[PDB]
Amino acid sequence: STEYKLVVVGADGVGKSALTIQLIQNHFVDEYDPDSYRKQVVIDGETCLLDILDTAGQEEYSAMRDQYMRTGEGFLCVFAINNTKSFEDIHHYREQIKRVKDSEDVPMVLVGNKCDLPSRTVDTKQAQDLARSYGIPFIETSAKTRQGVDDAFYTLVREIRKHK
Numbered sequence: 386s387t388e389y390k391l392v393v394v395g396a397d398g399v400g401k402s403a404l405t406i407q408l409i410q411n412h413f414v415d416e417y418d419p420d421s422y423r424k425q426v427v428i429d430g431e432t433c434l435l436d437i438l439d440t441a442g443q444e445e446y447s448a449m450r451d452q453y454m455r456t457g458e459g460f461l462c463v464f465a466i467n468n469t470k471s472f473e474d475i476h477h478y479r480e481q482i483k484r485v486k487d488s489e490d491v492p493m494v495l496v497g498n499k500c501d502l503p504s505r506t507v508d509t510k511q512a513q514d515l516a517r518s519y520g521i522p523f524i525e526t527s528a529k530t531r532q533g534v535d536d537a538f539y540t541l542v543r544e545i546r547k548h549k
């Protein structure tokens with residue numbers, strides 16, 4: 386079966402690592418010290434291997450971040466629903482991915498994480514309008530309750546499958 390390399394990007398603290406660890410290990414972590422992990426899953430009846438590359442801890446413009454992005458086939462662009470700044474930063478990460486892959490057509494999913502937390506500052510309509518402007522899906526997640534987590538990563542695999 387095919388292996389899919391998925392890279393998780395977003396501002397520090399939005400939950401890249403907690404999402405990754407929930408996907409792989411089925412546990413929520415209160416802290417993560419920065420990173421790649423593999424797991425076999427079945428998506429739409431089709432077995433595949435996920436290789437998740439977590440950019441947590443990499444400096445904003447590091448050579449290793451660029452290598453991670455070059456290696457990736459699809460990207461999760463994560464913000465936190467309780468952090469307007471991290472939502473405003475999404476364009477930065479999208480631009481970086483486009484530069485590194487040297488393409489305007491890169492499989493991506495927009496992920497609004499921490500949807501369990503009370504203090505929402507980003508509406509689902511704002512996020513869906515950004516996603517719509519990029520032509521990509523939007524998925525709301527909580528690494529803590531597991532809502533949306535599988536759906537985010539699996540939707541990204543579906544996007545890659547549509548790209549090849």
Ligand SMILES: Nc1nc2c(ncn2[C@@H]2O[C@H](COP(=O)(O)OP(=O)(O)O)[C@@H](O)[C@H]2O)c(=O)[nH]1
Pocket residue numbers: 395396397398399400401402403404414415416417441442498499500501502526527528529530
């Ligand atoms: N309540 C809640 N906390 C989260 C969620 N995702 C991550 N966290 C927490 O937010 C902090 C940052 O998460 P981390 O995964 O290290 O963020 P990263 O820097 O983007 O990798 C930690 O204290 C995590 O427990 C979530 O969906 N809900």
